[PDB]
Amino acid sequence: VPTVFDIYSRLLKERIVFLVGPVTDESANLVVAQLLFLESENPDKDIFFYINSPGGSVTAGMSIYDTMNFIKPDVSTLCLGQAASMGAFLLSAGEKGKRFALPNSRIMIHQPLISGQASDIEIHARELLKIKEKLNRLMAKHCDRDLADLERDTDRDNFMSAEEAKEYGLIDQILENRASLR
Amino acid sequence: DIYSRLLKERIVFLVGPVTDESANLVVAQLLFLESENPDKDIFFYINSPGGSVTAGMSIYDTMNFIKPDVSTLCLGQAASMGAFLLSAGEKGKRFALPNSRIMIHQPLIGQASDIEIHARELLKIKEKLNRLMAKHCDRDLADLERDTDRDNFMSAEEAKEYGLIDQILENRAS
Amino acid sequence: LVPTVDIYSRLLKERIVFLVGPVTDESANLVVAQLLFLESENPDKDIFFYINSPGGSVTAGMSIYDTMNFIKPDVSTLCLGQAASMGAFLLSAGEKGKRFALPNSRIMIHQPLISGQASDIEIHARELLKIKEKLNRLMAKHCDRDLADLERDTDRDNFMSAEEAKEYGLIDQILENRAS
Amino acid sequence: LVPTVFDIYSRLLKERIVFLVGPVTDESANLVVAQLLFLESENPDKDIFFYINSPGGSVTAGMSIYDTMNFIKPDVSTLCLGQAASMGAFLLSAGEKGKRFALPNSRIMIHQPLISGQASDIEIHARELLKIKEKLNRLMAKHCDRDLADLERDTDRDNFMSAEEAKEYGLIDQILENRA
Amino acid sequence: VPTVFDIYSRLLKERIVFLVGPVTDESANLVVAQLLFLESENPDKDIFFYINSPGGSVTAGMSIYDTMNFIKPDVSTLCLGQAASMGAFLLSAGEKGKRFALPNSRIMIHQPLIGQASDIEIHARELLKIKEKLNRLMAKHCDRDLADLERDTDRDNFMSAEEAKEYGLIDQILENRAS
Amino acid sequence: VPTVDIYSRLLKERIVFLVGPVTDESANLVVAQLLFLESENPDKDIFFYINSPGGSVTAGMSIYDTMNFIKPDVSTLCLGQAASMGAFLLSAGEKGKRFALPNSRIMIHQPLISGQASDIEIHARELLKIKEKLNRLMAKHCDRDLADLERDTDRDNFMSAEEAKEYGLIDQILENRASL
Amino acid sequence: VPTVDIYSRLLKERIVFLVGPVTDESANLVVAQLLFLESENPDKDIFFYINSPGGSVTAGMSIYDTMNFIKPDVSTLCLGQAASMGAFLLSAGEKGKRFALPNSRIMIHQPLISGQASDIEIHARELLKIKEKLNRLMAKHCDRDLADLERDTDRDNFMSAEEAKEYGLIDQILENRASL
Amino acid sequence: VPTVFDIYSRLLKERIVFLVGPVTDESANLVVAQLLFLESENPDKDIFFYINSPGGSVTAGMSIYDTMNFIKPDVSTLCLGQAASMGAFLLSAGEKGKRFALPNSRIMIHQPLISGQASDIEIHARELLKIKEKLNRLMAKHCDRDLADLERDTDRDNFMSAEEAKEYGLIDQILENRASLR
Amino acid sequence: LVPTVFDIYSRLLKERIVFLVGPVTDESANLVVAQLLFLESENPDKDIFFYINSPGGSVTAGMSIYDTMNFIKPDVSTLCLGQAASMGAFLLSAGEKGKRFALPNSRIMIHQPLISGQASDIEIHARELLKIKEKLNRLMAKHCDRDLADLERDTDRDNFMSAEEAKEYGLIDQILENRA
Amino acid sequence: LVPTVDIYSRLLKERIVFLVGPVTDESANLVVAQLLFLESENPDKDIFFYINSPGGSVTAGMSIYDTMNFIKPDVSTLCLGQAASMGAFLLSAGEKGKRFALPNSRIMIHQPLISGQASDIEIHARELLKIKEKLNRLMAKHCDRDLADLERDTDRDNFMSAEEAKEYGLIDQILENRAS
Amino acid sequence: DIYSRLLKERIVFLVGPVTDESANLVVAQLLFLESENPDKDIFFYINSPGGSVTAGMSIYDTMNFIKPDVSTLCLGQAASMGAFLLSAGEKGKRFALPNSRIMIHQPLIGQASDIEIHARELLKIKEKLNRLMAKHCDRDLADLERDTDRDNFMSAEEAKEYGLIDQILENRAS
Ligand SMILES: [K+]
Ligand SMILES: [K+]
Ligand SMILES: [K+]
Ligand SMILES: [K+]
Ligand SMILES: [K+]
Ligand SMILES: [K+]
Ligand SMILES: [K+]
Ligand SMILES: [K+]
Ligand SMILES: [K+]
Ligand SMILES: [K+]
Ligand SMILES: [K+]
C-alpha cells in the first residue's frame, strides 16, 4: 500500500472509507471502526463510503448498516465496480440524496442464500425466513417502494444497471464526472 | 453362499446402514420369497443403526404390500429406521433377543425459498413417521413426539412395554 | 454381494425391472437392456418397472423413456421409496392406468438443474431452456394437465405424497397390498 | 452387476445388438470392434444393430469403430438413444444410409475437435489437430449429403439438434416412435 | 482363499466357525448366519467357535452372544491368538465346561470406551448402562461377584491362559487333544 | 521492495501500475492512487502503466469509471502485455495519450467464465449484456464500428503494438522519449 | 466382457489385440497369445490388431522378438492409431501383410523418458543406444536409409495411412476385403 | 486372460512359467508354486522359465533361485524384453547350457540398492554388504568368471546387449527363431 | 530476511545496481522496471548495473524489462552471475553493447519458446507462439551481430554456453575476472 | 524472529557474512550483495565468510565464487558445522592462507548430482559432465592437488575431518580459539 | 523485544530443536557478545530436545573458540545435542534448575557402496561425541558408550554425579 501515510490512511483523512471484496466480520468491523473514528474527528462533516463488493455475511453487514445510521455524520455511498447482495443493501442505506453510482457499476439484489435434527432445522429455517422478511422491509424503505415490489424483485438474482438502480430508488444520482451532482 | 442358503429358510437380513442399495436388496428378497410361496411367514432379522428414510420406506411398504406375514427380529440393535422397521413386523410376530437395544429419535440431516420447502418436507416426514410408529406401538402421536425429541435408548423389555415388539426370545421357549 | 438362486435375475423372470439410485448412462442402459430383453422373451405381456430414484441425467432418462414407449409391452410403473425429478418423470410415463405408488412413497418434481466463453454459455443456456420446455410439455401430457400448471408447479422443488401425486395425474392408483 | 439370463448384454448380442455407452475410450471402442467382428463371423448376411448413448471421446478410438463398421460385410444400423454427441454423432451418422435412426427424444450434438512443450512440438500437434478437424468435416458432409462449407459453419461451436433437426440435416434417416 | 468348497466353507462341514479381527456388524452377522445354518443342519451337535479378535462393536458382539444362547447346539469356544474386550466376552460366553484356550493365547478384559450437552448426557448414560450390564454378564460367565468384575475392568487387564482359567473365563487349556 | 518504497517514490512522478490479474483489491488500489494524484494536482497527466492479463470485469470497470471521472488525463502505457480487461483499460486512456512499447502485445476477446435453469437463464442474459456493453465501449475507444469489435473478439485476438495502433486501441508506439 | 468371452472367441480366428499402452503385462499377454496360436497351427497367419499410443520399449521388444521368432507370419493391422512403439510393431509385421484402415493414423518419434553424474552418464548412453538401434530396425522395416529415419523421428511425425504406406511402414490400406 | 483354460494356465501345461514385472513376495511365490507343481506333474522334463523383469525384492528372488536349484527338472531360462537386477540374477541361474535370450533383450546387473539408531544402521549396513558380496560370488559362479570381475562390473548399472550377456557368461545362446539352439 | 545497513538491496540501489534473481514473473519483472525508472529519475546521466542470475520465465514479463532498458536514457550495463538462461540470456544480450559482461564461471543458455481448448483456439495460440519464436530469434540475431539462420539453428534445443563461448557468439562483450 | 541491536546486520559491521543451509539463487545472491556492500564500505579490508551449508545449486554457488574472486578484499573462509559439496567448494575458494575450520567441523566432497526426448537428455547429460570436469579442475587448483586425485576422491561422497581437510589442501588452518 | 533486551544482559537461549537456523542464530549472538566485551561471562540457557549434530557442533566449536566463558543453564530439559551443549559449558559454570531433566543417547537418523560410506561416517560421529562427552564429564569413552546405547534420562542430581553439570541452582544461594 503506497505511502505518500499509506494510501488508504491518506484517503481516510479526506473522510473516504472503502468496502472492497467480501463482507466478513473483520472487514465489516474495520469499516465500523473508521466510521467511529471519523465521527470522533468531526461529527458534522459528511463521510464518503465507497463500495465495491459482492456481498457476504448478513450480520457483519448489519454492523455497518446500524453504525451508519447511528453516527451523526451523514454517510454518502458510492458504488464503483459493483454492489451485490449486502453490498447493494449498504449502498442503498446511504444518506438519502447522497447515494451514488459510477456509470458502469452493477447492482444486484436477491433473497438470502445459505451454504441437524428436524427441530433445529425448523428453528433455523424460521430464522432465515424472518431475515428474508426484514431485509425486504428495510430495502423497501430505502427504495421508497412497496414491500410487495421487494418480495417480487428479490426472488432470484436481480441485476441492475446504474440507471435501473436509480429508477428503482436504490441510489439517488449517477455521477460520470465532477460536473454531476445536481 | 451363506445368505443365499438362509434365504431358502425364508430368512432375510438388514445389516448396517439403510441405503437405497441395501433397502432394495431387502425388497427384492421379500418379493422373491412371496413369489416362491405367498402364504408362508418371512423372518426379517434387523441389526441396523438406521439410515435413509425413503430407502426404509421402500422396505416398510413392501412388508405391508406382500401377502406373507413378515416377522421381525432385533439382534444387536435396531435404531432409527432400524427400529421403525422392527416395529412394522406383523403384530404378534415382532421379537428381540434379550440383549438387543432399540433406539428411536426424530429425523436427522440454497435460497431461503428452497430451504423453506425442504424444512417443511422434513417436518411432514417427522409427523408421518411419528403417526405410523404410534400405530405400530398402539400409542399416541403425542407420546412419540415426546419420546423421540432426542435419542431414546430402550432395552428389549423397555421396547416390549412401549409396544415396539411383542416378545423377547431367549430361546425357542417363547 | 448379491444372494444367489442372483436375485435380480430371478425377479427379471417375473418381468420385474428396477431403477434404484441416480440415473446415469450406465444405470439407464441396463434398464433399457432389460426392457428389450423382456420384449424379446414375450412381446405381449406387461413389464413391471419399480422405481426408487432421486433422478439424474436427463439424456440417460430419455433413453429409458423412449424405450418404454417404443417396445410393444405395456410398462407398468411402481414408485417405492421415492421418485424424484427424472425418476418422477419416468414413473409418470408408465402405461396409463398402470402407474402405481406404494402408500408411503414420495414424489418430487422440479425444473432442470446443472450442478467458458459467453458464446458457448449462450448455446448451452438455450439448450437447458429447450429441455425445460420439453419436459414440461411431456409431463403435462402424462399428467393430463396444462403446461401452465407444470411450468408453475416445477419452478422450485415440489414434494408430493402418493395421494397428491394421484390427484395431480402422475399416477393412477395407490396400492396398499395385493387387494387394491 | 449385470443380470443373468447368460449375461444380459451377451444375451442381446445374440440378437445382434451392440451398445456404445458413455465415453469412447480405446478399451470401450475396441470392445465394440470386437463385437462387430464377432457378429460378422457368426453371420455376415444379417444386419448389426449399433445402439449409441455416448457424449463422445477419443477421436482415434472412434475411427477404429468407424473403419470397422465400413470394413465388415453387414450393414451396421445405428440408433441414437438418450444422446449421440461429438464422436457419438459421427458414428451415428456413419451407419448404413437408410438404417440410421433416432428415438424421438434423443439429442444429437456436433462440434469441432477439442483437446483437454517446445514451440516446434506445439506446431506439430496443432497441425495434426487441424488435419483431424478438416477430415471429420469432410466425412460428416459425406454422411449428411451436405456441402463441406455447411459443416464448417455448423460445427464451429456446440450444435445441438433434436431428432427432427438431425433428420433434416442428413445425420439420420428416420425417427422411430415404436414398432409400427 | 483356497478351495477343496472354499477353505472356510469346508471347515463349516466340521461345524467350525471363526471370528477373526475387529467385531463389526458385518463380521458379527456373518457369524450369526453360520450359527443359524449349523443349527438347521443339525441342532443336536456341538458347534466349535474359534475366536481371534481384539473386540469391537458392543452391539455387534451382542448379536453373536444372544444367538449363541438362542440356538439349540452347544457352542464350544476356543481362543487362539487373542480374545480381548468383546472377543473375551464371547469366549467366556461358551457353554460352560466347553470353553477353551490354547496355551499361548492371551485374554484381555476392560470397560467400554469410545453435540449438545443434552445429547452427551443421554449417550454417557447409555454407555454406563452398557458398562453395568457387561459387568453383570461377565460376573455370571465367570461365576464371580459383580464387585470383582467392576474392580478388575477399570483399566486394561491382560490375562494368560492359566490366569483366564483361574478367573472363570474359560474351563480348560488345551495344548494338544489332551482331555 | 527497495526503499527510497520504490512504488511510492514513483507515485510522486504520477506513475501508477497495474500488474498481474485484475482483482477487487488490485483494482481498488489503482483507484486509490488515481484519486490521490487528483487530490495532489487535478490538471497534470497521470501515467498508468499496464502489464496485466486481465481479470474481473467489474473490478476493471471500477478503474475505468475512475479514469473517466477524475479531471486529470490518464495516459496509459502497455508494457509486456495488456490482455482482455487490461487491453480494455489501455484503450480507455485519454485519446492521444495511449501508448505501447515496441515489443508489447495486446489481446482482446469476449467475456469468459469459470444451478436451476431459471438462474442459469438470468446469469447467461447478464453475461451477454456484459459482452454487448463491452463491445460497445471498445468500438468507441477505437473509433470503430461495433460490428468490427463483435467480429474481432469472438476468439482471442492477439495484436502487436503496430496492429493495436492501427486498430485504434493505442495512439503511438514509444521506443524512447523521441518517438513522440 | 460379452461372452460366447469375446476376445477368446476371436482368438479362435487367430486375431490378437494390442490396445492402449504397452506395459510389461499387456505386452506379455500378447506374447502368450502369439505362442498359443503357434502351438495350435504353426503355418497359418496371425492377425495382430494394434490400437496403441506406445509405451515401454523393452515390453514392446518382447512382442517384436516373439513375432520374429515364431513360425507363423504375423500380419499387423492398425486401427485407430499406432504411435511410437505401436507403430514400431505395426512395421514389424511380415512384409506384405502390414495393413491399416483408411482413417488410421501412425506416429513415429525418438525415445522419450519421464542421481550422480556417473549414473546419469550411463543411462544417457544406454538411451542413445536405444535410439540408434530402433532407428536401425525401423529403417530396415521400411526399406529406407537410416539417415531418413534419424531425420524423420527427431520430433513427433504423424502420418496418415497413405503416408505410412508410402514410407514403407505399411504395405496396403484396407477399406474392406476387396481392397486387397 | 483369454481362455481357450486361461491362456497362462494353458501355457503351464506346456511347462512354461512366466515372471513379468517386479519381483515381489507374491509374484515370486506364484512362480515357486508353479515350479513345484510342474515337478509333481513330471520330475524329469525340462521347465521353461520366461523372464521379463526389472528386478525387485532380493529375498523374494532368492526363493525362486533356491527352488530352481532344488527341484529335479532342469529350469531353462529365457529373457524376453529385459532381465535387470534380480531378473538378470535369475536368468543367469538357469540350467547351464539352457540359458537363452531373444535378439533385442536387454540385461542389466548392479549392486544392491535400498530405499534408526547408529547401532541398528551398523547392523543393517553390515548385512547389506554381506548381501552384495554373496550376490557377486553367486553371479561369478553362474557366469564362470572371476569374483573380481563381478565386483568391478556391478559397481554401477551395467547394461548389456544379448551378445554382451552371452560373452559375459550370463546366458548360453541367443535364439532368433526355431533354427537356433545348437 | 535482508540485512540492515537501509536494506542491503536498497543500499546497492544507491550504487545503481539492480538485480534480477530467479524466475521472471510479472511481479519480479515490474520490480526491475520500477528500479530502472527510479534510477533514471535520480540521474539519467549515469549507467545502471543490471546483475542477472535467472533461469528465465515469462516472455511478456521479460519484454517489459527489455523495452524499459531501451527506453530510458542510461546505458543499462548487464552482468551474468551464476547463470542467464532463456529470457535471462535475452536480457543479458540486450545490455548496451560494449557493456555486456559475464563472470568467468557463469553459464548462458538459449532456446526456443516453451509452454508448460477448441481447435480454433489451439490454432490461435499456436500462431502467437510461433510469432514470439520468430521475433525473439530476430532480436537475438540483432543482439549477437549474427545471421538469423544461425540463431534458428542454435536455439532449436537447449544451447548451453560458457562465458567464453557466449562472448564468441556475440551475446556478451567481455568477461570480468576482477577489478583490473 | 531475529533479535535487535538485527544481529546479522550488526555482525556485517564487523565484515562477517554467513552462508547457512542450502545454496539457492536467493541465498547465494544475498551473500553476493553483502560481499559487494563490504567492498564498497572498504575495499582493502578482509571479509570473513562463515559457511555452514550442505551445498545446493551449482550455478548459485558459482555466483558466490566469482564474486569472491572479483572483489578487491581478501575473503577469508571459516567452516563451522559442515561444508559439504558446493559449501566445501566455497570454503576451499577462500583467499589462500585464510581458509579455516573449527575443530569439529565436517567437510564433504562429491561429484555433481541431479535429484524428455533422448536428444534433450543428451544435451543435459553433456552439460552435467562439463560441470563435473570444471569443478574437479577448480577444486584441484584450490587444493594444490592433481585433477586425477579429485576425480578419484569425489566419485562417491567423501567425508573429511578438519585435519583431513587440511592435509588434503582444502583449508589452511584449524582454529580452536583466538590463540591459534 | 524481550530476547533482545536479555541479550543486553549477555543471556542467550537455545529453545526447541537444534537446526542450522536456530544454531547459527546462537552462534551469531555469541560472536556479538564477544565483540561487545570479550572478557565477560556469557549465560547460555538451554531448553532443547536436541536436533542436528552438525548444527550443534557449530555452537560447540563457537563456545570454545570465543574468549568469554560460556556458562550453561538447563531449564526444562536438555536432551541429546541439548545435553551435549549443556555439558560443554565452562567447567565450574554448568548449571541446572532443580526439576530439569537431562537425556543422553547415541546418534539417530541408495547403493550399497553409499550406505557403507554413510554408516561409517555415522559411527565416526558416534565415537567422537562419546569421546567429547567423556572429556566434559571426566569419564571414560567406555562409560559413555555404555550409558548412551539407549535413551538415558537423568535428574539434575544424577547429571551432577555423572559430571555433565557442576551445580544445581534452586536460587542464587549457589
Ligand atoms: K448518519
Ligand atoms: K405382509
Ligand atoms: K410400451
Ligand atoms: K458395413
Ligand atoms: K446354545
Ligand atoms: K480523466
Ligand atoms: K514370424
Ligand atoms: K533344477
Ligand atoms: K538505455
Ligand atoms: K577477493
Ligand atoms: K569460551
I41 at interface of F, judged by CB pairs closer than 8 A: yes
Q: Which residues contact E41 (CB under 8 A, 6 or more apart)?
A: none
Q: Are D68 and D97 in contact (CB under 8 A)?
A: no
Report the alpha-carbon distance of residue F69 to residue F63 in Å, rounded.
Answer: 10
Alpha helices in chain B (DSSP H): 2-7, 20-36, 53-65, 81-87, 112-137, 141-147, 156-162
Nearest-CA neighbor of E60 among B99, H85, C42, C86?
A: B99
List the single residue in D115, D119, D130 with the smallest CB-CB distance to I133.
D119
Q: Are J19 and J47 in contact (CB under 8 A)?
A: no
Cross-strand partners of H106: H82, H161
Q: Are E179 and E165 in contact (CB under 8 A)?
A: no
Report the alpha-carbon distance of residue J68 to residue F49 in Å, rounded.
Answer: 39
- Are residues B29 and C82, on separate chains, in Cβ contact within 8 Å? no
Chains that contact J by 3+ CB pairs under 8 Å?
G, I, K
Distance from CA of H123 to the nearest CA of K (A): 10
Of these residues, K22, K48, K71, K80, which one is catalytic? K80
Give I31's contacts in chain F (Cβ within 8 Å): 1-2, 6
Q: Are K39 and K67 in contact (CB under 8 A)?
A: yes
Nearest-CA neighbor of D68 among D19, D103, D31, D99?
A: D31
**Mutate: best of F65, F74, F126, partner A, most A CBs <10 A:** F65
- Are residues D103 and C26, on separate chains, in Cβ contact within 8 Å? no
Give A18's contacts in chain F (Cβ within 8 Å): 28, 32
Residues G52-66: b if buried by 16+ CB within 10 A, e if exposed: bbbbbbbbbbbbbbb
Q: How many CB atoms lie within 10 A of CB B80?
A: 25
To which residue does cell 556479538 refer?
K32
Q: How many CB atoms lie within 10 A of CB K131?
A: 13
Backbone phi, psi, residue G178, to 5°: -125, -15
Which of helix, strand or coil describes residue B2?
helix
Helices H, strands E: what count in chain J? 7, 7
Give F115's contacts in chain C (Cβ within 8 Å): 113-115
- For ligand 10, the distance from its centroid to the CA atom of residue J68, given in whole angstroms, is 5
**Which DSSP letter does residue G4 get?**
-
Nearest-CA neighbor of I65 among I85, I42, I88?
A: I88
Chains that contact A by 3+ CB pairs under 8 Å?
B, F
- For ligand 11, the distance from its centroid to the CA atom of residue J168, given in whole angstroms, is 29
Provide DSSP, K113-160.
HHHHHHHHHHHHHHHHHHHHHHHHHT--HHHHHHHTSS-EEEEHHHHH
Report the alpha-carbon distance of residue A144 to residue A132 in Å, rounded.
Answer: 18
Q: Which three cell numbers stand for residue F146?
A: 461495433
Q: Are I174 and I167 in contact (CB under 8 A)?
A: yes
Backbone phi, psi, residue H42, to 5°: -165, 105
List the single residue in C157, C176, C178 with the smallest CB-CB distance to B117.
C157
Q: Give the CA count within 13 Å in the CB-facing half-sphere of I95.
A: 27
Q: Are I101 and I172 in contact (CB under 8 A)?
A: yes
- Enumerate residues 96 to 155 of chain B having a beta carbon within 8 A of any beta carbon in chain A: 105-113, 115-116, 119, 122-123, 125-126, 149-150
**Mutate: best of F79, F109, F110, F170, partner I, most I CBs <10 A:** F79
Q: Are J68 and J48 in contact (CB under 8 A)?
A: no
Q: Are B44 and B89 in contact (CB under 8 A)?
A: yes
G53 at interface of H, judged by CB pairs closer than 8 A: no
List the single residue in J113, J118, J155 with the smallest CB-CB distance to G128.
J118
- Are residues G121 and J129, on separate chains, in Cβ contact within 8 Å? yes
List the single residue in K109, K115, K149 with the smallest CB-CB distance to H128.
K115
C59 at interface of D, judged by CB pairs closer than 8 A: yes
- For ligand 11, the distance from its centroid to the CA atom of residue K70, given in whole angstroms, is 5
- Are residues B111 and A116, on separate chains, in Cβ contact within 8 Å? no
- Are residues G79 and D33, on separate chains, in Cβ contact within 8 Å? yes
Alpha carbon distances (Å) from J93 to G42, I166, J159: 72, 25, 18
Distance from CA of J127 to the nearest CA of K (A): 24
List the single residue in B8, B32, B58 with the smallest CB-CB distance to C10.
B32
Residues of G with a known catalytic role: 84, 109
Residues of I with a known catalytic role: 86, 111
Report the alpha-carbon distance of residue D71 to residue G78 in Å, rounded.
Answer: 13
Give B147's contacts in chain E (Cβ within 8 Å): none
Pairing of strands C106-109, A16-20: unpaired
Backbone phi, psi, residue D31, to 5°: -60, -40
Report the alpha-carbon distance of residue G26 to residue H69 in Å, rounded.
Answer: 30
- Are residues E66 and B100, on separate chains, in Cβ contact within 8 Å? yes
- Are residues G6 and D61, on separate chains, in Cβ contact within 8 Å? no
- Are residues C32 and D81, on separate chains, in Cβ contact within 8 Å? yes
> Where is J136: in which H helix or E strand?
helix J118-143
Give G52's contacts in chain D (Cβ within 8 Å): 26
Distance from CA of C156 to the nearest CA of F (A): 9
Report the alpha-carbon distance of residue B52 to residue C20 in Å, rounded.
Answer: 13
Give H129's contacts in chain K (Cβ within 8 Å): 112, 116
- Whether chains E and D touch (3+ CB pairs under 8 A) is answered by no
Q: Which three cell numbers stand for residue K138?
A: 571426566
- Are residues F71 and A178, on separate chains, in Cβ contact within 8 Å? yes
Report the alpha-carbon distance of residue C76 to residue G8 in Å, rounded.
Answer: 40
- For ligand 5, the distance from its centroid to the CA atom of residue B73, given in whole angstroms, is 18
Report the alpha-carbon distance of residue G125 to residue G135 in Å, rounded.
Answer: 15
Residues in chain A: 182
- For ligand 7, the distance from its centroid to the CA atom of residue G64, given in whole angstroms, is 9
Of these residues, D28, D77, D86, D93, which one is catalytic? D86
What do you get for the CA distance between the two ends of chain E, in Å?
Answer: 32
Q: Which three cell numbers stand for residue B117?
A: 420447502
**Mutate: best of K53, K106, K113, K150, partner H, most H CBs <10 A:** K113
Please tell me the experimental approach by which this structure was elucidated.
X-ray
Residues of E with a known catalytic role: 85, 110
**Ligand found nearest the CA of K42:** 11
Q: Which three cell numbers stand for residue C29?
A: 442402459
Compute the 3-state secondary structure of chain D and give helix, strand, coil in percent, each to the nearest 5: 45, 25, 30
The distance of Cα E41 from the centroid of its chain, to the nearest Å, equals 23
Give C156's contacts in chain B (Cβ within 8 Å): 113-114, 117
Report the alpha-carbon distance of residue K87 to residue K135 in Å, rounded.
Answer: 10
Provide DSSP, C48-90.
EEEEEE--B-HHHHHHHHHHHHHSSS-EEEEEEEEEETHHHHH
Report the alpha-carbon distance of residue J174 to residue K102 in Å, rounded.
Answer: 31
Give K106's contacts in chain H (Cβ within 8 Å): 117-119
Alpha carbon distances (Å) from C167 to C143, C162, C163, K134: 9, 9, 6, 95
List the single residue in B3, B62, B132 with the smallest CB-CB distance to C3.
B3
Distance from CA of I109 to the nearest CA of J (A): 11
Of these residues, C27, C76, C85, C105, which one is catalytic? C85
Report the alpha-carbon distance of residue J81 to residue J102 in Å, rounded.
Answer: 8
List the single residue in A7, A80, A157 with the smallest CB-CB distance to F65.
A80
Provide DSSP, A77-111.
EEEEEEEETHHHHHHHTSPTT-EEE-TT-EEEE--
To which residue does cell 469432410 refer?
D138
Nearest-CA neighbor of J148 among J159, J136, J138?
A: J136
Residues of A with a known catalytic role: 85, 110
Which of helix, strand or coil describes residue C98?
coil
Backbone phi, psi, residue C109, to 5°: -125, 150
- For ligand 6, the distance from its centroid to the CA atom of residue F144, given in whole angstroms, is 21
Q: Are H118 and K107 in contact (CB under 8 A)?
A: yes
> Where is J120: in which H helix or E strand?
helix J118-143
